[PDB]
Design a protein around this ligand. Structure first.
Ligand code: HEM
Ligand code: HEM
Ligand SMILES: N=C(Nc1cccc(O[C@H]2CN[C@H](COc3ccc(/N=C(/N)c4cccs4)cc3)C2)c1)c1cccs1
Ligand SMILES: N=C(Nc1cccc(O[C@H]2CN[C@H](COc3ccc(/N=C(/N)c4cccs4)cc3)C2)c1)c1cccs1
Ligand SMILES: C[C@H](O)[C@H](O)[C@H]1CNc2nc(N)[nH]c(=O)c2N1
Ligand SMILES: C[C@H](O)[C@H](O)[C@H]1CNc2nc(N)[nH]c(=O)c2N1
Ligand SMILES: [Zn+2]
Lengths: 405, 403
């Protein structure tokens, strides 16, 4: 019957039609001849005006005022401003709506049940690297909130014609050092090799531990970046122990409480906020499966299996699956004990199914990237595994952007 | 512009150029991706597919462009022009079946693709004859537990008449008996086929693991019922290497996975009954068949036996039971000496396959959501590997249920 993607849940037998994808203005990487959905990197003038008009229409709808005089004056305001300046500026309440809408729009986030609850710090008055540092520290203090984490975003000035960008160089506000060795290996987190070497080229005195917190490299328009060390008491970490395996604590493993992405671009109504770091809380599989067990990350699967006395010489003992489970349980248990917000992959995905049902009623669909939504252990044990998903790009949005160097 | 395909664990990059040869559209468009969807959203026609397939064949035997080739193309041409259809030589059929398996994007076992026993059953005129061919196939493929991949191919679709079909979705399937209180005894995926069997006269049982009969159908005839002789259906009792109470759950599974409702398309010709088999990957039995909520759904029972905290997701009880159940399956198949492959060995060998395919053909169509196992995804190398999905022919396809 309906001319929109049919979407099926194979566990419960239920069908829906996504009508929201109609609202996609921006193409993704797929064509009728080939599906490129599994690729991680999906490879103005009047152009700005129409993005702006579209965003202002979205704002007036969210407050139920489409067609009103407040609505048509705001449009006229926006084009007048572009008319003479080439760009325009967002009201405070517009920025707050657009930031939540960007989270809500993100196909790869499983945490969107929470989308309506986001503290938006407005930092569009910021004019130096020192000041960014102050805002960032404020963000971390508020978001961390002694372990009872609160979702938050801090928005720095938008991109502007000619003038250089605001940029945080690090990919997260909290990142462990990755030190390349003589023996070709790496101490710390291999993911952070490059940002580590940049920090050093820029005058940071490197440690040599597995869990050295990096300084921040902050860049204000048309200036070399500057280096700022986070005060250690601001950076809450959790030491990792296991509820029954007494030796697990002796491994000296740890992770930080606050995940906070700092290198993504927040785009709203054509405006481009190149520095707009955002934070929530972790799903446990991010730490316990990916960060600790990826072969190219900490890679601790073998060491843990040896302690558990598993047969690591044969795949069919499932030593990998057993070790990974215990690591995940340790992460959950240690966060619980420390009273630091965290969510397991079962709670997370159940809440995402609720989110999908909310959005079906509210917008008639929800863009979602199945390969990312499904957890990296125990996939089919979660209800998202059995749920078809339609992936597409809406604006406002979080986007990847080239690295500044 | 061709796709860049990156592996994120090793940082290596390929380009897929094989996809340029795709002639069929997939479910996606520029505006939206539909890859996680499970089901799909004249003479010159047949003639191009035929020419193209005959060209694939002669190329493969390196006898391309020449005499045997040009004459084979004329034969196909002469036959289509007069009859609106043609027929394949046995050795072409053999090439086509292997190539259809090779091209299947959802298949993690393709390293094996060159090793396929092909039974030509195109001289089949009755359900009875289909039954005999189906038994030889089971007997050959099972091989007392040393499983061997096989396909049996029945007579192709013809404009004039209905299809040869096997109603059952696999050759071995456990009964599912719906209760008046909604609930199911046996395998809830097989409720509708169980019911069809009874309607066509089968005496039901009441076990959790009662093996179904086959419903075989010769063209335009009511389907016919046939019982598989119990000694043809090899089964493995499930026990656990260290948990003695596990055996007592009375769980088992059959050795031979043989798909029997898909359509085999070669050279524009369609083979509506062409059952195929190989061997199981352990996660198919251990994770999906026994732990899916809408399958036998044994996760809670196992967790209670292991004495775990059921009250909370965050004890990871589900993850712990799943792992033991998969362990039980591998141990049990190893003990009965029946071919099985675990998901680590399987995905490791699929990686080697992508690499062979890259050198040979310049790409490999693969469906990431189906290749990555349903437990321990990121623990296998495939998780970390970008994959391009597209339809090449020869191919296995879905087709509608005959009832
Ligand atoms: C409330 C707690 C939250 C949880 C548990 C959560 C969970 C996640 C997870 C697990 C991922 C995938 C991570 C990975 O594999 O690298 C993700 C992606 C993402 N989330 Fe969240 N999220 C939360 C809140 C937030 C917030 C506050 C924002 C921004 C306002 C956000 C925006 C994103 C974006 C943009 C991505 C995808 C990044 C990319 O495409 O590469 N989420 N989320
Ligand atoms: C030799 C051992 C083999 C193994 C271990 C294997 C493994 C698998 C697995 C795990 C799947 C996913 C099935 C599911 O989740 O339901 C699959 C899909 C498939 N395999 Fe295999 N395979 C093997 C051999 C074969 C053979 C011999 C054929 C046919 C000649 C074949 C054709 C297929 C096809 C067509 C699919 C796709 C099914 C669909 O689209 O629904 N495979 N394979
Ligand atoms: N490689 C780099 N740049 C770069 C360029 C393009 C993309 C990119 O990756 C994104 C996707 N993946 C990465 C992280 O995204 C995440 C990470 C964690 C995450 N998890 C959470 N629970 C939350 C974070 C924030 C709110 S919830 C949610 C999203 C960030 C990194 C650099 C490394 C060092 C300096 S530049
Ligand atoms: N049944 C429905 N939808 C439907 C229709 C066609 C196909 C389908 O799913 C596929 C996926 N999967 C199924 C069989 O595929 C398999 C199964 C097992 C398998 N495993 C193996 N190891 C092998 C089998 C043979 C050689 S290796 C490899 C492939 C078949 C579902 C309907 C619901 C309501 C009205 S109609
Ligand atoms: C190749 C593949 O796209 C890549 O490994 C993806 C798979 N799914 C993922 N899912 C999440 N949430 N995060 C990731 O980094 C990835 N990696
Ligand atoms: C919606 C989703 O695509 C569906 O559940 C798929 C996911 N991946 C799968 N992968 C395999 N091998 N088998 C399956 O049945 C499925 N189910
Ligand atoms: Zn796609």
């Amino acid at each position: 019957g309906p001319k929109f993607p049919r979407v099926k849940n194979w566990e419960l037998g239920s069908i829906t039609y996504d009508t929201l994808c109609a609202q996609s203005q921006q193409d993704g990487p797929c064509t009728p001849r080939r599906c490129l959905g599994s690729l991680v990197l999906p490879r103005p003038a009047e152009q700005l005006l129409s993005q702006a008009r579209d965003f202002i229409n979205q704002y007036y709808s969210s407050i139920k005022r489409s067609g009103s005089q407040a609505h048509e004056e705001r449009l006229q305001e926006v084009e007048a401003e572009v008319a003479s300046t080439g760009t325009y500026h967002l009201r405070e309440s517009e920025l707050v709506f657009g930031a939540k809408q960007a989270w809500r729009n993100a196909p790869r986030c499983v945490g969107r049940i929470q989308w309506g609850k986001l503290q938006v710090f407005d930092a569009r008055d910021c004019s130096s690297a020192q000041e960014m540092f102050t805002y960032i520290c404020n963000h971390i203090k508020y978001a961390t909130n002694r372990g009872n984490l609160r979702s938050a975003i801090t928005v720095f000035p938008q991109r502007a014609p000619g003038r250089g960008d605001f940029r945080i160089w690090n990919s997260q506000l909290v990142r462990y050092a990755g030190y390349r060795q003589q023996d070709g290996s790496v101490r710390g987190d291999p993911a952070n090799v490059e940002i580590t070497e940049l920090c050093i080229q820029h005058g940071w005195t490197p440690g040599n531990g597995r869990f050295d917190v990096l300084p921040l490299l902050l860049q204000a328009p048309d200036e070399a970046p500057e280096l700022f060390v986070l005060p250690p008491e601001l950076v809450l970490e959790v030491p990792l122990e296991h509820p029954t395996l007494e030796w697990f604590a002796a491994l000296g493993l740890r992770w930080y409480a606050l995940p906070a992405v700092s290198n993504m671009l927040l785009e709203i109504g054509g405006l481009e906020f190149s520095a707009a770091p955002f934070s929530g809380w972790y799903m446990s599989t991010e730490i316990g499966t990916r960060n600790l067990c990826d072969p190219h990350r900490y890679n601790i699967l073998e060491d843990v299996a040896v302690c558990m006395d598993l047969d690591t010489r044969t795949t069919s003992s499932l030593w990998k699956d057993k070790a990974a489970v215990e690591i995940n349980l340790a992460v959950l248990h240690s966060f619980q004990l420390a009273k630091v917000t965290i969510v397991d992959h079962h709670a997370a995905t159940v809440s995402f199914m609720k989110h999908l049902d909310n959005e079906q009623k509210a917008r008639g669909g929800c863009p979602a990237d199945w390969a990312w939504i499904v957890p990296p252990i125990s996939g089919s044990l979660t209800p998202v595994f059995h749920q078809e998903m339609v992936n597409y790009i809406l604006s406002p949005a979080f986007r990847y952007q080239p690295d500044p160097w």
